Design a protein around this ligand. Sequence first.
Ligand SMILES: CCCCCCCCCCCCO[C@@H]1O[C@H](CO)[C@@H](O[C@H]2O[C@H](CO)[C@@H](O)[C@H](O)[C@H]2O)[C@H](O)[C@H]1O
Ligand SMILES: CCCCCCCCCCCCO[C@@H]1O[C@H](CO)[C@@H](O[C@H]2O[C@H](CO)[C@@H](O)[C@H](O)[C@H]2O)[C@H](O)[C@H]1O
Ligand SMILES: CCCCCCCCCCCCO[C@@H]1O[C@H](CO)[C@@H](O[C@H]2O[C@H](CO)[C@@H](O)[C@H](O)[C@H]2O)[C@H](O)[C@H]1O
Ligand SMILES: CCCCCCCCCCCCO[C@@H]1O[C@H](CO)[C@@H](O[C@H]2O[C@H](CO)[C@@H](O)[C@H](O)[C@H]2O)[C@H](O)[C@H]1O
Ligand SMILES: CCCCCCCCCCCCO[C@@H]1O[C@H](CO)[C@@H](O[C@H]2O[C@H](CO)[C@@H](O)[C@H](O)[C@H]2O)[C@H](O)[C@H]1O
Ligand SMILES: CCCCCCCCCCCCO[C@@H]1O[C@H](CO)[C@@H](O[C@H]2O[C@H](CO)[C@@H](O)[C@H](O)[C@H]2O)[C@H](O)[C@H]1O
Lengths: 98, 105, 115, 318, 83, 345, 69, 172, 114
Amino acid sequence: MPSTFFNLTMAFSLSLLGTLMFRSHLMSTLLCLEGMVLSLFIMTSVTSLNSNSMSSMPIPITILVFAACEAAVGLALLVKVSNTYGTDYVQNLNLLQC
Amino acid sequence: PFLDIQKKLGISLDRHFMFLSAEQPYKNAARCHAFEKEWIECAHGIGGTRAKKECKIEFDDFEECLLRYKTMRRMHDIKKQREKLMKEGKYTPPPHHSGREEPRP
Amino acid sequence: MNLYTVIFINILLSLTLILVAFWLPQMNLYSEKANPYECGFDPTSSARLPFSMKFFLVAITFLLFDLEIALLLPLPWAIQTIKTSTMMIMAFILVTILSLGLAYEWTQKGLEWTE
Amino acid sequence: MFFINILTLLVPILIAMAFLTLVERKILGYMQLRKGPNIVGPYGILQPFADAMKLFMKEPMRPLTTSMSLFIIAPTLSLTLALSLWVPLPMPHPLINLNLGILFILATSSLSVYSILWSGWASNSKYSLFGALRAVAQTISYEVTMAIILLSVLLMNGSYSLQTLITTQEHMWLLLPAWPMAMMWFISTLAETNRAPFDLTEGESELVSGFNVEYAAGPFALFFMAEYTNIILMNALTTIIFLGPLYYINLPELYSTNFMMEALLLSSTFLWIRASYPRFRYDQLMHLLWKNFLPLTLALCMWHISLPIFTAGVPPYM
Amino acid sequence: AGRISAFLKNAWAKEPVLVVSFSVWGLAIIMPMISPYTKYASMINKATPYNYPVPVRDDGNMPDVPSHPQDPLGPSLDWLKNL
Amino acid sequence: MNPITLAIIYFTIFLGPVITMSSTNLMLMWVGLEFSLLAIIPMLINKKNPRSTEAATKYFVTQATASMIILLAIVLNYKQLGTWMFQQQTNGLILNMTLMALSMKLGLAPFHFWLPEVTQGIPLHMGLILLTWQKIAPLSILIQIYPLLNSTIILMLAITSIFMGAWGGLNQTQMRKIMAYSSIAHMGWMLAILPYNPSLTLLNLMIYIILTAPMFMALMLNNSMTINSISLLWNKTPAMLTMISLMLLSLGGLPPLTGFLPKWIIITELMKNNCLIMATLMAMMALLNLFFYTRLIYSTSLTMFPTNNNSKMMTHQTKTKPNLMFSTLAIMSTMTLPLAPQLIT
Amino acid sequence: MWFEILPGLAIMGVCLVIPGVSTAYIHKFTNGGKEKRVARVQYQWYLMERDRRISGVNRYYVSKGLENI
Amino acid sequence: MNNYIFVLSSLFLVGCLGLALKPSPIYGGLGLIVSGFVGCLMVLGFGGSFLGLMVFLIYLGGMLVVFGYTTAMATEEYPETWGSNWLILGFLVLGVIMEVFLICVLNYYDEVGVINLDGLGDWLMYEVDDVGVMLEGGIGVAAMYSCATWMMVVAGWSLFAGIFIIIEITRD
Amino acid sequence: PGIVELPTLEELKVEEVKVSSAVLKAAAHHYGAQCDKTNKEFMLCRWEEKDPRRCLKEGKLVNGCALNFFRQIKSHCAEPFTEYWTCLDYSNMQLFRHCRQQQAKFDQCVLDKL
Ligand SMILES: CCCCCCCCCCCCO[C@@H]1O[C@H](CO)[C@@H](O[C@H]2O[C@H](CO)[C@@H](O)[C@H](O)[C@H]2O)[C@H](O)[C@H]1O
Ligand SMILES: CCCCCCCCCCCCO[C@@H]1O[C@H](CO)[C@@H](O[C@H]2O[C@H](CO)[C@@H](O)[C@H](O)[C@H]2O)[C@H](O)[C@H]1O
Ligand SMILES: CCCCCCCCCCCCO[C@@H]1O[C@H](CO)[C@@H](O[C@H]2O[C@H](CO)[C@@H](O)[C@H](O)[C@H]2O)[C@H](O)[C@H]1O
Ligand SMILES: CCCCCCCCCCCCO[C@@H]1O[C@H](CO)[C@@H](O[C@H]2O[C@H](CO)[C@@H](O)[C@H](O)[C@H]2O)[C@H](O)[C@H]1O
Ligand SMILES: CCCCCCCCCCCCO[C@@H]1O[C@H](CO)[C@@H](O[C@H]2O[C@H](CO)[C@@H](O)[C@H](O)[C@H]2O)[C@H](O)[C@H]1O
Ligand SMILES: CCCCCCCCCCCCO[C@@H]1O[C@H](CO)[C@@H](O[C@H]2O[C@H](CO)[C@@H](O)[C@H](O)[C@H]2O)[C@H](O)[C@H]1O
């Protein structure tokens, strides 16, 4: 358990680094936001199982429920960004500086 | 909460599964139910600031049951001291620790 | 352990057939053989260019309905509760809002593919 | 002794898969007023082995535009998951006994869609990319209803264990209390396995060969072995779930023989269906599943939630 | 009241999937209300004994708690045997 | 959007903060933060043009990333203590990561660069919602854990926000940016006093809301986004100049207007705790707000900028705005200093 | 004719019965002539472990009855 | 078998390292499937079952959609792979070096606290009702229908509203 | 800080009930109705005390009655009992419902004989 949380927590940090360090595609930054959901879900699942807290096992499911909605809303926005410039490159989303 | 509506209406939307010692399905206690139930009863009514000092005994025990830092430390020391003796050659485990016990029942 | 063994055995067979397929035949490689196929003529452009998805709205509506499966799959355990009235009422509502959500999308031409 | 038990699963299945290719070509034959294979061996029985040997001596293809890592992985994954779907099947005792077998079947089946996607995408050809994007469309079509149909049937069974379906159907097929879900279940399995009138990922008429157009030789052979293994499994699964074979604890040989007869018969109906109908349009496959099956499946889910409640017929947990 | 029959016959002719879907949806919400068995679903689930029935200390003011399980007192599952 | 969508979307926008505010469990507090994030997105991007799409995208990736960090705190805390609420014994680093994430959600500097741009790409009424109602949910979480917050992180964020909000707003000709930087500066005041007296953070929030609401309503009257657009008010709605000016001075903290009360009481309570240096810089940089608020007042009520010919048609027509709420919020947001003792406590 | 399909359909049939029959017998051959014990819940797994410990040969399927007390 | 869980969490870590370097979303979707599968095996090792297979099921349908969106909106002529660019290839290799270093280092200065390589396996399952019957994670997750019904209201409403949310976002 | 008090290995010695689970399960219903008072006190001790060291006497009376109960069957109904549990052992879930015929014979031995 000790070794697992450290590896899981560092997994969350790597995805937070991935999310905070953009490249071209906006879709790739969306997949890092799913790397974070997966890390958090696995931590919560292991925590609840290790402590035998069955009443907390609903909570990991809601994380998946409220993580899909973001993935859906994120993908819906990615469609509107593509319908404007023909790609999902972030460097195009810069009109608002002025 | 910031708007104690649940407390006002007397309902419980999410108040009843806040901690380990809460009710579980089919009356299955959680790990460290005894310790947590002690800590929450110790720190009840005296407030957070008093509880941080006057229920330190209950809390440090619950923290030890939940995370077992001292237990792993202690069992690390016993196994590491035995590793040292066996390399020198001053200790051979018993038969019941080397896979040759007379099993119970 | 068994379930790990049986699947490595499956993987090793799939690998083993893969190796035999590549190192057994007599291979004669030249550029015109290894070009991509397109009904006898040269491709006019790479196949990595964007490919419009005319059912994208249904694709993301699959995600929302996919997670609503994750909420109905605990039901076999849930019909074992004493609080049968509660379990049933929550189940009926859940399926009914999935249906109400589906009806709204259906009537909004959401299930129709974009032309 | 467990390794010998793998042999008596993976080998009979692979032999049975091959002859399904022969039975397909002869049943399609006689349904078309011809004879199908009957020269390569007595009544063609050696024709499957000729095709296999020829395909593994055919030169394999490494197209210049291809992504080789996924190009190779995809057929390997395909045949692995086809064989892995079999280890939990109780006949009547399974090789691997899983509490949530039904989910293992659902999850393994879904992951096998990525062999179609990755192979098609890795081919870097237009016809193979059309085939892959039909695999995406086909899965979005049948996935939602297929899981819910299973949920409805399992509320009469009590668990996700496959071995408990044997005990549910001790006195009656689940086909009777559930024939509306069996009808919808059966059509899903034709969509799950890319079988006519739903062979849209391949679809030789419109796409030259779809996702595996750039595959030749032994790598292409693995894709087919996977396709025909799945046919037997999905019909074998349908036989357990809905047509429960006779189970006597003293005659386990009876259950297997009866299980086989119904699995063969259902496998034939896949070949019968392929000879009888035109191919769906893959946009119309979505409309079939979302505008017909899904409204019915949600209602049946709500019917079967309430049904054990108002008859006091809740299945036992164990 | 007169036009509805025309509509329902119309839908039943050309849209039986939806007419079947609404009927089954609505029939599933009525059947628990009127069945004379809906009450046993809870009772049977409550009568399934997963946890150990931890005995209570007999102080002396327990005239309706059995001493031995084969006593004529306590909850009985006769209604379930004869169900 | 059809009435069903509005009812569903506007209910969800309202629902989010009420779930966060009424919830004992942290995961339900997080759930409310998700409802607000998801349901505001369609509202922001309703006009569907290149600028609102960028605005709705920058907002989504910012607020989703901040959500994941908050959730990590809620989960690392459940690992440490087996409970779904922050305790006095919660690890220190768990609390700080919650603070930085929530400030990222509020727009506090240095996590602020998103807010002025998002406010710029969206319509005025959704800027009102975003700069007001959307701040209550993150703030209600923070007020629930004020005994635990590290004051050094809170004061560096507040000092930064007061400086950046002042400097940022000084360079802006777009009204929507002037409102975003106005927001950033005021959040600095709410946050600076949070670990000491959370009641004063609610006073400063409420007074800011009733000042920021009519100001948006005033710009929504003629749909005026620039300093030159708002300069035409003397020839369009001259009846509005008397209350625009006071509200701008009130937003500036000038006495004897209601907006002096929040700064004055926060400074007073900060120095009850010996927070002299921070308090002095805060008040000294709040002076810069008044300069670019004064510049706006110069352009609108204290001078008459050149007007155009087509504005004569505008005068022949009859307006049905503003409503009865604008007048009520204008008076209460400016002429209520003599009721100060009834507002603080 | 159509019955010429049977030679292949019969092979496929024999093949599909070997899995079920071979697994049932192999389980009896590796579990002392009894069905492989199923353990769905922890309680049943405990019974197997106890049976393994009291057997005397470290095999759960070597049952001991009243001979042993 | 004592290193089993440690290896699964180590594989999970890499899958998110590869994911963080962000090659073409075709491969980023491949890392999420393998991390999703690896993570599923961890929840299984710790005694879960329903939670393990669900996160695997849900992420199988998510990457199916994500694949469809990549080929339509996030695809360029020369998709990047982990070996495509020398600089990314450097940080994937270097990233693996660091973990071999951080684990070895942090294991040196505490020996038990964080990483206890000396005692991998000894501390995986703490307690377990050996004579239990009702302990599957499904029973805990199923409490949403009786005890934590509030969880399901917000979850159901989240999905219900989302259909309305996306139909308006994507509307022409 | 304290020293956990553990009983010595000779405080934990009793005569074991070394019979397989099928043997217990075949005799489980009668045994529950015969060793009930002894059994019901150990469980009360265990839930009241929340300590296994405090009930190492009631728990040796559990083994006392379990062995007596089996000695009464090894002296009146050995063969009807041995046919029953040997048939209960075959099933992979040891289900009663496959042995209702042997079960009947064992019941009609204890009833008349005991
Ligand atoms: C240090 C070993 C530990 C593992 C390290 C990896 C952790 C994960 C980091 C993920 C982010 C990668 O960080 C990366 O930063 C570089 C700049 O360096 C940026 O990348 C940008 O510049 C680089 C350099 O010319 C280009 O190669 C790249 O195509 C471009 O997008 C991106 O913002 C991000 O892709
Ligand atoms: C917004 C979406 C709404 C659409 C969906 C609406 C669904 C509404 C469903 C209402 C059906 C509830 O049906 C109700 O079932 C419960 C239990 O199941 C029955 O209740 C009965 O059985 C239970 C146990 O089963 C007994 O403990 C109880 O004393 C008895 O009354 C009620 O008599 C019946 O009325
Ligand atoms: C704003 C909050 C207050 C209102 C509270 C919510 C209740 C609203 C009740 C009035 C409902 C009217 O909402 C009604 O929505 C439907 C779809 O649902 C719209 O109808 C729409 O779908 C139908 C489907 O057949 C088609 O004709 C067409 O695509 C479109 O008109 C109607 O044009 C509108 O009349
Ligand atoms: C318990 C539930 C709580 C429900 C809470 C409801 C809060 C009140 C919401 C008010 C929303 C109406 O406010 C909003 O008004 C503005 C005008 O200012 C309109 O916005 C308008 O902007 C410009 C000009 O103004 C037009 O070009 C545009 O097409 C139009 O949208 C919006 O269409 C309307 O949505
Ligand atoms: C995707 C890449 C995955 C690769 C991940 C790495 C796999 C290898 C696991 C390394 C973890 C430590 O692996 C191994 O752990 C054991 C105990 O668990 C350590 O400790 C072992 O030796 C020590 C003495 O040194 C003794 O106390 C005892 O024999 C045992 O504890 C070993 O020194 C180490 O070799
Ligand atoms: C305006 C927006 C909101 C409107 C929509 C939401 C309406 C609320 C619907 C959810 C209702 C949940 O209802 C709430 O259920 C919980 C448990 O589920 C009950 O709470 C119960 O929990 C457990 C049950 O085992 C007991 O230990 C506890 O003592 C008891 O209070 C509450 O008494 C009931 O109020």
